[PDB]
Amino acid sequence: RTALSPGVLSPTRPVPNWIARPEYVGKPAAQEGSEPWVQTPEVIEKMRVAGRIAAGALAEAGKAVAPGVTTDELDRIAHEYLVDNGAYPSTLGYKGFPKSCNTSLNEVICHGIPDSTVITDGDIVNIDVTAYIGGVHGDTNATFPAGDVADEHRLLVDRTREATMRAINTVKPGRALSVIGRVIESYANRFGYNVVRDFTGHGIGTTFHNGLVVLHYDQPAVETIMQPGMTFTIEPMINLGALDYEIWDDGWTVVTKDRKWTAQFEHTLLVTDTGVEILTAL
Ligand code: MET
Ligand SMILES: [Cl-]
Ligand SMILES: [Co+2]
Ligand SMILES: [Co+2]
Ligand code: NA
């Protein structure tokens, strides 16, 4: 299997005018990074809607992953599901991003752009979908096997899913946020994998990325304590090889320098009065 290189994009996909756009669409930048981390009950309930829709789009696009399918096609499918459900694809026009989801194959860590790239037998394909509806965002991602995937890569996918779920299970009010990355890194190390450091989870709500950072490695110097009504993502990227990476000239696609493959899963979470709720649930 060759290393990937950039392909070419299809034209911007339309969205019905009556689906509300985020404030940033049609601007070079968004207004974000200073929003309260704790959401109102109003916003939380709206985030359940957005999260369900994003989860559905993810699942629909996932079902389409097969050898010979292009990553643009996956984007068409995600896009159409969002629009059929009255949601806007948050990534479309975000910081100029040209598509409605991110599609990251093999050595791509994250933020791949859907394009002419053809899925080859044996690939692993992350699809990352964010829905904006009712003035709020819901963000989820999963890595899917395409055709006859090697056991090594099947296990990498399955263990990254399980790392993510284990971390989710530790979310609790009154507990340090740092527990999340402790758990992920412990589980990744169990199976000799390496957790990506420079890319993190994030607070999300009325804005796509607020100032809250969720580390996916063990960093106990973080003092933040989880509180009820906080909303954020857990989205670890887990590598078979070294952490070193490059960013392509598109400014988005992040790739391992050694070209070994890497998997990711993501949910949007709520800290409740006593525990957690996965908002991006089918
Ligand atoms: C083009 S922005 C993609 C952002 C991504 N969905 C995230 O989880 O942050
Ligand atoms: Cl890193
Ligand atoms: Co995402
Ligand atoms: Co995210
Ligand atoms: Na990857």
CATH classification at residue 254: 3.90.230.10
Q: How far apart are CA 1 and CA 149, in angstroms?
A: 12
Q: How many CB atoms lie within 10 A of CB 230?
A: 22
Resolution given for this structure, in angstroms = 1.6
How is 60-76 classified by DSSP, letter by letter?
Answer: HHHHT--TT-BHHHHHH
Please, are residues 208 and 50 in contact by the beta-carbon 8 Å criterion? no
Q: How far apart are CA 180 and CA 230, in angstroms?
A: 14
Protein residues whose CB sits closer than 6 Å to any atom of ligand 1: 91, 94, 97, 102, 111, 128, 130, 139, 233, 235, 266
266 marked as part of a ligand binding site: yes
Residue 185 lies in a domain: yes
DSSP letter, residue 249:
T
Q: Any idea which residue has 């969205």 for tokens?
A: 15
Residue 202 lies in a domain: yes
Q: What are phi and psi of 277, to 5 degrees?
A: -135, 130
Residue 50 lies in a domain: yes
Structure token digits, residue 260: 């070994």
Residue 15 lies in a domain: no
Structure token digits, residue 126: 């992350």
Q: How far apart are CA 188 and CA 156, in angstroms?
A: 9
Whole-number Å distance, alpha carbon 278 to ligand 4 midpoint, is 13
Whole-number Å distance, alpha carbon 129 to ligand 4 midpoint, is 9
* CA distance to 124, 159, 239, 262, per residue, from 258 (Å): 17, 21, 11, 11
Please, are residues 244 and 255 in contact by the beta-carbon 8 Å criterion? no
Mutation test of ligand 1: which of 103, 128, 252 has the most ligand atoms closer than 8 Å to its C-beta?
128
Whole-number Å distance, alpha carbon 41 to ligand 5 midpoint, is 36
Please, are residues 10 and 72 in contact by the beta-carbon 8 Å criterion? yes
216 marked as part of a ligand binding site: no
Expt. technique: X-ray
Helix axes 151-169, 178-190, angle to 10 degrees: 150
Q: Any idea which residue has 């629009």 for tokens?
A: 83
Q: How far apart are CA 105 and CA 95, in angstroms?
A: 22
- By residue range, what is the domain housing residue 80? 37-280
Strand partners, 111: none
- Based on the structure, what is the number of domains in the chain? 1
Please, are residues 71 and 115 in contact by the beta-carbon 8 Å criterion? yes
Q: How far apart are CA 70 and CA 212, in angstroms?
A: 34
How is 198-248 classified by DSSP, letter by letter?
Answer: SS-EEB-SSSSS-S-EE-SS--TT---B--TTBEEEE--EEESS-S-EEE-
How is 102-114 classified by DSSP, letter by letter?
Answer: EEEETTEEE-PPP
* Helix, strand counts (H, E) of the chain: 4, 15
Ligand 1 closest atom vs CA 209: 9
Angle at the Cα of 156 (from 256 to 178), degrees rounded to 5?
A: 80
